[PDB]
Write a protein that binds this ligand. Structure first.
Ligand code: MG
Ligand code: MG
Ligand code: MG
Ligand code: MG
Ligand code: MG
Ligand code: MG
Ligand code: ZN
Lengths: 175, 132, 36, 58, 207, 142, 134
RNA sequence: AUAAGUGCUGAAAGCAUCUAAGCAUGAAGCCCCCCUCAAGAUGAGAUUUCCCAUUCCGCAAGGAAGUAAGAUCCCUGAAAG
């Protein structure tokens, strides 16, 4: 089938707003979200109904026609409840802690590594061996978790370093 | 120390505007000097910007909305706008020239009556707005 | 593993394109390869 | 001569490769490029020639 | 930043408190005087002018007299311009004394090298010689001019000509002692220029 | 016998805009307004052209992947010293120079062709200082 | 006079800004004087002010004052600074040294006004107007 | 700002995907920062200060003569050659 053809509801507090040049925004119980779209593409919304009218078929139109819909879906979902992603931390003593608003991780390096997030996203730590990022949008938490993981990639010979909240790494043997 | 004139009300014509021209020019030039500029080219450019007919017209219109004036001020503004004289410049129309004449006449009448407390404040406000 | 002739080895190697090049990506990184 | 005629026959909406065709068609106007050119010393007759040309191009 | 202008006088030595020898270059000064200000609304940068070592009134012409008579002082012989500086602690006529360098600071010293004349290659560019025996007829000559194929000489060869006399800047020197009375500045090391010459002592750019 | 005009010519200033136009397609009619091949009195050795002013020169465009793969080379006279610039850095920091180099390759090469090139006035903005010559407007014929 | 304040570094203005403010000063004085004398017709006020505010009458007034042993050292320096300033485009119907000598006069007036030397400027322009009108 | 690489969201292809839209990171390389020369940059720039109320011919353009600020000739020399 196709994903650019499904439908999208709109909760009560979630209020979308159409504007010239197709630059829809959203007002919800967790913050705002604006994202300009392609000028050619047509966006049309009804109460509890989302529609993406596509012009004559082409190679790039069948792509944009799904991209915009997926983005609107992610947007309404984030403004409804928001996304998050945890970060397990195995170590043999590798431990993360909190300091004001920023993050500090004492990996095997010889000096503490500092990680500070941008505005609109917070970094919570529920325990000294786990990190959990929380934010409204999806690409933001994605990028923040990637930049936090890229401090210490997981070694394959033994689980050592940062890894995602649920993932399997391969294992060799060393003697 | 300018000795007073025999009367500052029988100047029915444009003499009020004639003096107000040079008064406003002195004020805006001294202000531009205080800002710091010294080259004559940009000094003259900004001076012309602030002293043009349309600029004075817009400043008068804007100050009209603030009710910054009193009764005799409206009296002298009217007496200035009832002036029919000369020919308007080729670059501008016949309407805004009358507003400029009114502003210049008001400035001249304020100057020629030793009311510097109103004059300095009025020109300070006019310059402040025109430099927006 | 650069070579002018890329083709899957096991059954689970995919073939994609990036920036106008031919790449074979897989789960076992001994099979990852790129044409040109 | 061809450059000057081309310049003088574009302030009328024609070009050269169409003015010349319309002149060869509208009757047989045998005015040489030298004299048709020189007649841009005054641009009242040349406009008449160009109008007679533009007639036959429809 | 900050800086002044003085005269090289010659090298000497001083013992520190550790009891160790230190080469030292002496530089005299006087109260310099700000003669002009170059702001960004009149020019394209920020810079003040400094004067130094006034000269007697017979050796000055009317242009220079009139230029230096707007700060109410005497015709100065050396005029320069210190560009990168804060321009609110300087007024025309005000002075800039030597008392702005504390001990143990780090400065730069700009000066004109001393002339060497028309020098060859072995001395100018520090090249090598040929042999002096074994039947040779080659020593103290600048070498091959290059390959045959270009049919010409590449721009950038190194030949004899006039050496020295350029402008040079030494970096990361250090103040030893600042005699506020006699207007002296003891700088460690040596500085370019012949004795009795103009020397510009600015603050450190690298940091 | 044909009128060969010489020191009997007049000139007139024109204003051209570059907001939303392809390079090489603008500099191909400007480079023939300068030369004089729009005047019924065109003589080939007197430079019967006229002056052209260009504004919004930082709004020019290039089709395809030219803003990354059009290079501008320039050589010094020293060995090894071949310097290079791409089109993005040029259009960002030297727009007027980009347009001057464009137009300069479309004119004759002698000693009249490089005084035809003194009549071109390129600017990067929306206001020009030449408000005394009464410069009229000129929309592109194509 | 007017109620202004001082401008920092008023002894460092080039010869042009001084004349720039002095032209306005002289215009104010001469217009107020022609109005005080008794007149209402703007045509006649222009036709008369264009007798004293021309470079010829200004150069003349300057030569008259100067040849009368009226000035001092600092006014002489300000005169030289006004006359030595080289800029502008000469008017089409005047010499190019009487122009300089009138710019010197306007620079003198402007420098006298920008230092709160009120009474000296007042008497100077008084004698200037008195000569020019005679 | 980039190279190779590592990417985050994301469809064509209901999944997957570094890319086609979009958002990053990433080298002794590249452009600045450091040092020197530089407006004959004939596109010959800017700033500050000195000199200017002459005399002849020439209807006029202009030409000529004495000069002003300043400079040079000539002489005593070297931190220069
Ligand atoms: Mg008026
Ligand atoms: Mg050896
Ligand atoms: Mg050759
Ligand atoms: Mg040819
Ligand atoms: Mg003047
Ligand atoms: Mg000696
Ligand atoms: Zn595989």
């Amino acid at each position: 089938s196709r994903v650019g053809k499904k439908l999208l509801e709109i909760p009560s507090d979630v209020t979308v707003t159409l504007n010239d040049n197709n630059t829809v925004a959203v007002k919800g119980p967790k913050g705002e979200l604006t994202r300009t779209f392609h000028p050619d593409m047509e966006i049309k919304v009804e109460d509890n109904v989302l529609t993406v009218a596509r012009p004559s078929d082409q190679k790039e139109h069948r792509a944009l026609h799904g991209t915009t819909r997926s983005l609107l879906g992610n947007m309404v979902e984030g403004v409804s409840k928001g996304f998050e992603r945890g970060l397990e931390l195995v170590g043999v003593g590798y431990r993360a802690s909190k300091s004001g608003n920023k993050l500090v991780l004492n990996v095997g390096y010889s000096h503490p590594v500092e990680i500070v997030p941008e505005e609109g996203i917070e970094i919570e730590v529920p325990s000294q061996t786990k990190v959990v990022v929380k934010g409204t949008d999806k690409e933001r938490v994605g990028a923040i978790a990637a930049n936090i993981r890229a401090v210490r990639s997981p070694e394959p010979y033994k689980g050592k370093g940062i890894r995602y909240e649920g993932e399997v790494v391969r294992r060799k043997e060393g003697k | 120390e300018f000795d007073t004139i025999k009367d500052s009300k029988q100047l029915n014509g444009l003499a009020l505007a004639y003096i107000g021209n040079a008064i406003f020019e002195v004020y805006v030039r001294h202000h531009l000097l205080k800002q710091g500029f010294t080259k004559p080219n940009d000094l003259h450019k900004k001076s012309s910007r602030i002293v043009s007919a349309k600029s004075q017209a817009e400043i008068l219109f804007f100050l009209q909305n603030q009710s910054f004036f009193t009764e005799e001020e409206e009296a002298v503004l009217k007496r200035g706008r009832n002036a029919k004289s000369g020919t308007t410049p080729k670059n501008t129309d016949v309407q805004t020239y009358r507003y400029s004449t009114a502003f210049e006449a008001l400035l001249g009448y304020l100057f020629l009556e030793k009311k510097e407390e109103r004059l300095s404040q009025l020109v300070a406000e006019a310059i402040q707005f025109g430099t927006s | 593993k650069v070579r002018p002739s890329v083709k899957p080895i096991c059954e689970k190697c995919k073939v994609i394109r990036r920036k106008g090049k031919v790449m074979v990506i897989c789960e076992n990184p001994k099979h990852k390869q790129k044409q040109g | 001569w061809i450059t000057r005629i081309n310049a003088a026959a574009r302030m009328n909406g024609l070009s050269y490769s169409r003015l010349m065709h319309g002149l060869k068609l509208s009757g047989i106007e045998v005015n040489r490029k030298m004299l048709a050119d020189l007649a841009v010393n005054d641009l009242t007759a040349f406009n008449q020639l160009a109008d007679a040309a533009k007639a036959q191009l429809n | 930043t900050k800086g002044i202008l003085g005269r090289k006088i010659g090298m000497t030595q001083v013992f520190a408190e550790n009891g160790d020898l230190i080469p030292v270059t002496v530089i005299e000064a006087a109260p310099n005087v700000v003669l002009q200000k170059k702001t960004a609304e009149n020019d394209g940068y920020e810079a003040i002018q400094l004067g130094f070592d006034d000269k007697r009134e017979k050796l000055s012409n009317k242009p220079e007299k009139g230029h230096v008579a707007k700060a109410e002082t005497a015709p100065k012989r050396f005029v320069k311009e210190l560009r990168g500086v804060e321009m609110d602690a300087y007024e025309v006529g005000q002075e800039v004394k030597v008392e702005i360098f504390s001990a143990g600071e780090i400065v730069d010293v700009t000066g004109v090298s001393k002339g060497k004349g028309f020098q060859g290659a072995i001395k100018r560019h520090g090249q090598s010689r040929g042999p002096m025996s074994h039947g040779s007829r080659y020593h103290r000559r600048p070498g091959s001019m290059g390959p045959v194929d270009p049919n010409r000489v590449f721009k950038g060869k190194l030949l004899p000509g006039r050496m020295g006399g350029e402008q040079i800047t030494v970096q990361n020197l250090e103040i030893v002692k600042v005699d506020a009375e006699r207007n002296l500045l003891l700088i460690k090391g040596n500085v370019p220029g012949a004795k009795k010459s103009l020397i510009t002592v600015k603050s450190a750019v690298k940091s | 016998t044909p009128m060969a005009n010489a020191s009997t010519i007049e000139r007139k200033w024109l204003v051209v805009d570059a907001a939303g136009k392809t390079l090489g397609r603008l500099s191909s009619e400007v480079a023939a307004i300068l030369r004089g091949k729009h005047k019924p009195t065109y003589t080939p050795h007197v430079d019967t052209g006229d002056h052209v002013i260009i504004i919004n020169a930082e709004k020019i465009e290039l089709t395809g992947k030219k803003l990354t793969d059009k290079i501008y080379y320039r050589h010094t006279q020293h060995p090894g010293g071949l310097k290079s610039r791409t089109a993005l850095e040029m259009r960002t920091n030297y727009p007027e120079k980009m347009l001057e180099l464009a137009i300069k390759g479309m004119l004759p090469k002698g000693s009249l062709g490089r005084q035809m090139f003194k009549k071109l006035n390129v600017y990067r903005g929306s206001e020009h200082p030449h408000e005394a010559q009464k410069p009229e407007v000129y929309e592109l014929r194509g």
